[PDB]
Amino acid sequence: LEAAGGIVWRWKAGSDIANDPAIASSKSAQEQLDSIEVCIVHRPKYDDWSWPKGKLEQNETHRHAAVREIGEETGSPVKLGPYLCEVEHTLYWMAQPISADDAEHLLDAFGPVHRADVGEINDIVWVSVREARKILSHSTDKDTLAVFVDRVQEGAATAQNLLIVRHAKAESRKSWKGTDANRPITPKGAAMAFALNRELACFNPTRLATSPWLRCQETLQVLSWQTERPMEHINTLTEDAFAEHPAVSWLAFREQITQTLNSRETTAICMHRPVIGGMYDHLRGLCARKQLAKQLIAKSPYMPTGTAMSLFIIDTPQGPSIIDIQKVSPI
Amino acid sequence: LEAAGGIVWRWKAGSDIANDPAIASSKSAQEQLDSIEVCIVHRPKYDDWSWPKGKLEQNETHRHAAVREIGEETGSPVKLGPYLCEVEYPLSEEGKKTRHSHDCTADTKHTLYWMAQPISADDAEHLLDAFGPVHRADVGEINDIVWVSVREARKILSHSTDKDTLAVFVDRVQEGAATAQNLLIVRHAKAESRKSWKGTDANRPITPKGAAMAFALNRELACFNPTRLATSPWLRCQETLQVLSWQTERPMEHINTLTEDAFAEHPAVSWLAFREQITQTLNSRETTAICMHRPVIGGMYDHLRGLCARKQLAKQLIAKSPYMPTGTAMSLFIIDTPQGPSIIDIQKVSPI
């Protein structure tokens, strides 16, 4: 029996960090943790308090089930943050509430979410991390909360989200009688790209970018259409541009990371494999852990075509540091 | 073996019909034919004159090859019109004036022909990604392109095979084909089952496989130069044509009165909305692509069926498999009459 859910958190209204989130990283882990409220729901069935979660629907992923279950039980649409853990079978993510307007832009991309009935949930509360430890009914949830605290101590509360998307399956260079720039994705590629939208939607992507080359454009265009977020073309990220000026490519990419951190919005960018490889050559060594760096590979099966990697980043004096990596596959 | 091509035609410059195509239908068949010009190409290898045509590429439809080959050899991009015929003759025959059948062992060539009309450079540019690339033939393949009257075509065509096809073009014209306009009806792609979808019927989307289906269909629909796009506002229909809309930059016009609910409630209103599209298609002389729900299509067909020019055509006008499977389309060529729109040709359009 598969289920998914998570710990939805926010900065306590009135706290210094809430008044200006940008100062979060200039605060200690304790100052941050003391400024956080987490969401706990009450199930009348067992008269218990726990983290919102629920069973996956038929052919639905755990990440999608998690966002849906949180919305159904807390009434809050959210975007997934770093992954927390799994319990013997439920997977948990820490997550942040998104605006009602943003949620509306994801209606078709994510799919429907129905409010739970009073017989499923009859109370929703927002408490501090200390109180959460006190009121949670099951030890399992307290453990997950402890993992949540670890993440915060490791800077997760200040992390921002960058989604890197490899273009979907495209026509072979062998049979394509056009230019490489207009080489399109194949019918199967369109299916993969289409199916991937519901997954990418779990991270509330509100800034879309892409190499101008058709195969990359077509990979995110339906998402762009449903979310009404125009795709920004980044000419300096084509394979030709990367081959000629790789450092200029890093600047282009790095600027998107800067925009992501400043706006605190999720950025999704469709890129070419060798270009992603070049980006990773610099990000690998900046990862928070060796385990993360080992996964940061722009090749299959680490990252097959039509799939993405949801990266959570904090900036450091040495460069952007990835604190978590989630491989995102369609269907 | 497999090839495709066609007779690309236009109204002679300076002629009355040319100065105002709208008057074409008020002219006799003989008046139309005498004011028409058809395109013939010269091949240096055979030093012959024939209709443009060429071998289908791997995984290409005959219809797509027809448009591409015409484009490669005549240099002008076109939109397919009514279908003409198919021919077959031994490969050894090709340079001979009169094509003769051979025995079972001989290698043969099978060619499908359509009548077609040139489209503007701008429209062609809008179809670049939807149709795909088209390069020009080299002087070693084609080294002259002429436009002649139907009478002269009969006199300069090097092969009997092409003269037979021209006779079919004549038959088609004599039946209104030169005045016909193109409406493409598109059934939405495979969609989520009503039982598993937990949203509204309005928002039920197509499946990833449906999306592949719709995407592949684009290069086929592109053969008819669709410049007007319409759809039921329901998501499953919108998503069936949105990639085409995106590529061609032609907005998708929502027609609320064509949803399944609207049709069930007011079927006559559905016909009016549908008929208004036919009116627009005929007046603009542009191809309209409209995505609809199966039952609503059946409802349109119940009226169109009896107006078909041939009973053979009426029998094919069925809104359901195997006649019209999900995710496929029907390209209709229509001429309007005092009793209502009359279909003179039907072409089933499927992907892959």
Angstrom distance (rounded) from CA A238 to CA A241? 5
Distance (Å, whole) CA B279 – CA B336? 9
Count the Cβ atoms, other than its own, within 10 Å of residue B350.
14
* Rg value, chain B, Cα: 21
User: Can you list the positions of beta strands (E) in A260-318?
Assistant: 266-271, 308-316
Chain-centroid distance, C-alpha A322: 13
Are B201 and B186 in contact, with CB atoms under 8 Å apart?
no
Asked if A212 reaches chain B (Cβ–Cβ under 8 Å), the answer is no
Indicate if B181-352 has the same CATH topology as B1-180: no
- Complete DSSP assignment for B83-102: EEEEEEEETTTTSSSS----
Indicate the residue of B58, B133, B246 with minimum beta-carbon distance to A225.
Answer: B246
C-alpha separations of A1 from A57, A66, B79, B81, B261 in Å = 11, 14, 55, 57, 39
Q: Which two tokens stand for residue A94?
A: 């820490």
Helix (H) or strand (E) holding B149: strand B144-149
User: Which residues on A lie below 8 Å from B58 (Cβ)?
Assistant: 175
As its CATH architecture, domain B1-180 has Alpha-Beta Complex (3.90)
In angstroms, what CA-CA distances link A204 with A24, A62, A200, A258, B171? Answer: 21, 16, 7, 18, 60
Question: How many angstroms is the resolution?
Answer: 2.2
What experimental approach yielded this model? Answer: X-ray
Dist. CA A308–CA A330, nearest whole Å: 9
Angle between helices A246-263 and A273-283 (to 10 degrees): 70
- Kindly tell me the sign of the dihedral angle through the C-alpha atoms of B81, B83, B87, B91: positive
CATH of domain A1-159: 3.90.79.10
Nearest C-alpha of chain B: how many angstroms from A193? 8
Instruction: Give the whole-angstrom CA distance, residue A275 versus residue A239.
Output: 6
What is the CATH number assigned to the segment(s) B181-352? 3.40.50.1240
Look up residue A115 and give its DSSP letter. P
Q: How far is B57 from chain A (nearest CA, A)?
A: 9
Mention every residue, 6+ apart, whose C-beta is less than 8 A from residue A102: A77, A204, A206
Of A230, A232, A237, A109, the closest CA to residue A166 belongs to A237
* Best residue in B215, B243, B248 for a mutation probing chain A (most A CBs within 10 Å): B215
Would you state the structure tokens that stand for residue A218, as one six-digit string? 């077509």
CA distance B351 to chain A (A): 10
Q: Which of A111, A178, A331 sits opposite B132 (nearest CB)?
A: A178
Helix (H) or strand (E) holding A39, with range, is: strand A36-43
Record the tokens describing residue B323, joined without a space. 């006649």
In terms of DSSP H, where are the helices of B75-159? Answer: 121-126, 128-131, 150-156
Task: Please give the radius of gyration of chain A, using alpha carbons only, rounded to the nearest integer.
Answer: 20
Residue from B168, B50, B53 nearest B110 by CA: B53
A vs B, Cβ pairs < 8 A, gives 58
DSSP-derived letter for residue A159 is: -
Residue B90, sorted as left (phi over 0), alpha (psi -120 to 50) or beta, turns out to be beta
Report the SS3 class of residue B243. helix
- Using DSSP's 3-state secondary structure scheme, residue A138 falls into coil
List CB contacts (< 8 A) between B133 and chain A. 177-178, 182
CA triplet A166, A168, B194: central angle to 5 degrees?
Answer: 120
Query: Which residues are CB-neighbours of B207 under 8 A, at least 6 positions away?
Result: B189, B190, B191, B192
Quickly count: other Cβ atoms within 10 Å of residue B103's Cβ: 6
- Asked if A177 and B133 come within 8 Å (Cβ–Cβ), the reply is yes
DSSP annotation of A230: P
What's the rounded Cα separation, in Å, for the pair A205 and A79? 9
Please name which of A209, A223, A191 lies closest in space to residue A306, comparing C-alpha atoms. A191
Q: What is the CATH number of domain A160-331?
A: 3.40.50.1240
CA distances from B271 to A11, B15, B263, B276, B288 (A): 57, 36, 9, 8, 16
Strands A36-43 and A123-128: antiparallel
Q: What are the extents of the domains in chain A?
A: 1-159, 160-331
Q: Which helix (H) or strand (E) holds B181?
A: strand B181-187
Those of residues 292-331 in A touching chain B at CB distance below 8 A are 330-331
Size of chain A, expressed as the number of residues it contains: 331
